[PDB]
Amino acid sequence: NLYFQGSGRRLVLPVSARTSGALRGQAHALARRLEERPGLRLDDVAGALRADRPALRHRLTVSASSVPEAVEALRAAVPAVPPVPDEPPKVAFLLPGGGTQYVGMGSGLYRENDVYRDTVDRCAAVLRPALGSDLRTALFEEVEPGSTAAFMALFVTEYALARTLMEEGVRPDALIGHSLGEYTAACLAGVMEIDEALPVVAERIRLIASSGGATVGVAACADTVLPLLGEGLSLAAVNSPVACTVAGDTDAVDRLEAELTRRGVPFRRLRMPAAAHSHVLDPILESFAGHLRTLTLRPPRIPYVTNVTGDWATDAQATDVGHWVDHTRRTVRFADGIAALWERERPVLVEIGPGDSLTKLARARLDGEGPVTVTTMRHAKAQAADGFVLAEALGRLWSAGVDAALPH
Numbered sequence: 117n118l119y120f121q122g123s124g125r126r127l128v129l130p131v132s133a134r135t136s137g138a139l140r141g142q143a144h145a146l147a148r149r150l151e152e153r154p155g156l157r158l159d160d161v162a163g164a165l166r167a168d169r170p171a172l173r174h175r176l177t178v179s180a181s182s183v184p185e186a187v188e189a190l191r192a193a194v195p196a197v198p199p200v201p202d203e204p205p206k207v208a209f210l211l212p213g214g215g216t217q218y219v220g221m222g223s224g225l226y227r228e229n230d231v232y233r234d235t236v237d238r239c240a241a242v243l244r245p246a247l248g249s250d251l252r253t254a255l256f257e258e259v260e261p262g263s264t265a266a267f268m269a270l271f272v273t274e275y276a277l278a279r280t281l282m283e284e285g286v287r288p289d290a291l292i293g294h295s296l297g298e299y300t301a302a303c304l305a306g307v308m309e310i311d312e313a314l315p316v317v318a319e320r321i322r323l324i325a326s327s328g329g330a331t332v333g334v335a336a337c338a339d340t341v342l343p344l345l346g347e348g349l350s351l352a353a354v355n356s357p358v359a360c361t362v363a364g365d366t367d368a369v370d371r372l373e374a375e376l377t378r379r380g381v382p383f384r385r386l387r388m389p390a391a392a393h394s395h396v397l398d399p400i401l402e403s404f405a406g407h408l409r410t411l412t413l414r415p416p417r418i419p420y421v422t423n424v425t426g427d428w429a430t431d432a433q434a435t436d437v438g439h440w441v442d443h444t445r446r447t448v449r450f451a452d453g454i455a456a457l458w459e460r461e462r463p464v465l466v467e468i469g470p471g472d473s474l475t476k477l478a479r480a481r482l483d484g485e486g487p488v489t490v491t492t493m494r495h496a497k498a499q500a501a502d503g504f505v506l507a508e509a510l511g512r513l514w515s516a517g518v519d520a521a522l523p524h
């Protein structure tokens with residue numbers, strides 16, 4: 117059953133106080149009021165909490181589908197974000213690359229949220245010629261791991277999730293993508309049109325996937341890893357002080373893993389037998405440029421940092437075919453890019469996509485500047501409903517000072 121059900125009963129209850137402090141206090145008060153009043157409907161308490169109390173500096177929220185569920189959450193409630201700053205905070209979207217896609221992702225939002233449903237539906241129809249199948253099959257029923265559809269499923273999930281949040285009035289002041297997430301960022305930023313981008317991203321993935329090679333993620337500083345490379349190897353990404361990835365010919369990768377083992381450096385072979393962001397891709401760069409030439413590229417209407425330089429993208433870069441070729445061939449400078457994003461805006465960091473991979477990289481790179489981070493979709497494995505994870509994200513965004521995030 118993926119028939120539309122609409123919104124369910126799940127609501128977000130906001131609580132604000134003036135002290136760290138009184139916040140805990142009122143959250144218990146509200147719980148005591150709720151169990152001691154069987155007249156009260158979640159319905160009305162949610163409304164009253166918005167209209168009949170000011171939005172103060174110290175905030176928390178709970179999510180609930182019924183009053184006993186809310187009572188228990190309000191008991192356990194502990195403030196999770198710092199008090200709202202005096203100016204409303206900036207919001208950044210972090211768009212993951214491949215590696216956390218799974219069959220079933222967002223199926224709860226597809227059944228509950230009509231913007232999410234329409235965006236997926238629209239992307240599936242656009243993509244049917246390039247893909248050769250209905251994307252919703254890969255999204256919700258079955259997919260070949262590492263296939264073109266599996267990667268397009270992640271792209272559309274990211275885009276549908278971003279549009280859903282913006283429909284709530286959470287619009288990003290800045291964007292950063294990792295690898296494939298940079299295309300999602302470009303579409304959200306106005307650099308590309310999602311309709312033209314869908315088939316081009318699809319053919320991009322085929323051209324990369326069929327170039328062979330291998331990719332190893334290494335849990336170490338890039339400075340530690342650099343001396344061990346290596347003919348036949350490229351530094352594929354620099355992600356955080358304890359994360360980088362190396363790609364190249366399979367034999368060169370095998371050797372690197374042997375020398376990494378001998379020095380006690382932890383690593384993991386990535387599933388995908390591809391070698392994105394490495395010399396292995398040279399034979400297909402010009403053909404891929406041919407596909408890039410069919411896009412209408414425009415300067416970004418929302419600023420974003422590119423992985424190419426680890427800095428804000430210039431209008432000349434965003435609109436240059438050769439820069440996008442570089443984005444595919446060159447190191448993903450995410451750790452730098454996340455520092456550039458932080459220095460300017462100091463924004464709330466909202467991961468748009470399944471899991472928390474960029475959130476962990478941000479925490480490692482931005483230690484100990486204290487970023488507030490928000491996560492938006494569960495790991496494959498997690499037992500929470502998609503609608504709950506999203507209601508929590510929005511409550512948390514409101515608690516941090518993004519007032520428009522609170523629904524209704």
Ligand SMILES: *C(=O)[C@@H](Cc1ccccc1)C(=O)O
Nearest residue numbers: 213214295296324325390392
């Ligand atoms: C990064 O996200 C990377 C993902 C990918 C796609 C196809 C084959 C290997 C790796 C990318 O899109 O450049």
